[PDB]
Design a protein around this ligand. Structure first.
Ligand SMILES: NC(=O)[C@H]1CCC(=O)N(c2ccccc2)C1
Ligand SMILES: [Zn+2]
Length: 139
């Protein structure tokens, strides 16, 4: 689990979105596993605006943060789960690391701010849904 809180927005994994997230929907993209809902309280997370390929992510199944090198956002084949059939997920970044289903929502951060959230895993890889291209989150 986990979310990003920036301005009047909440960013979550689309497959973990709640009834309240869907009742206050701003934007969702199934191909990216992202959903953004509106909030009444102001969030103070900072989104990174950069092309970093190194950062640190939180892994709840280890209660640890790990430093990782990750690929640039791209279209990557993702195995089927209970939430989606096997498909290409877009705007996904991969790194070598640990990720279980419950790790989704953990934040990946660089020196500039939040880069994305854990969205995929298995086979010793961890995949993060990028949020750096969503410039509107800042206004
Ligand atoms: N983005 C996705 O398609 C998610 C769907 C649900 C799910 O549990 N995914 C997953 C995450 C970590 C390890 C193993 C699988 C992938
Ligand atoms: Zn950066």
């Amino acid at each position: 689990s986990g979310a990003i809180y920036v301005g009047n927005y909440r960013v979550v994994n689309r497959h973990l979105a709640t009834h309240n997230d869907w009742a206050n929907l701003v934007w969702e993209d199934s191909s990216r596993d992202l959903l953004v809902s509106s909030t009444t309280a102001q969030g103070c997370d900072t989104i990174a605006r950069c092309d970093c390929q190194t950062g640190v992510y939180y892994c709840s199944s280890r209660r640890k943060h790990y430093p990782v090198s990750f690929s640039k956002p791209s279209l990557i084949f993702v195995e089927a789960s209970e939430y989606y059939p096997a498909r290409y997920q877009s705007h996904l970044m991969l790194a070598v690391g640990h990720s279980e289903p419950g790790d989704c929502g953990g934040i990946l951060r660089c020196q500039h701010g939040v880069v994305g959230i854990v969205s995929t895993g298995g086979n010793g890889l961890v995949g993060f849904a990028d949020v750096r291209d969503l410039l509107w989150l800042d206004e």
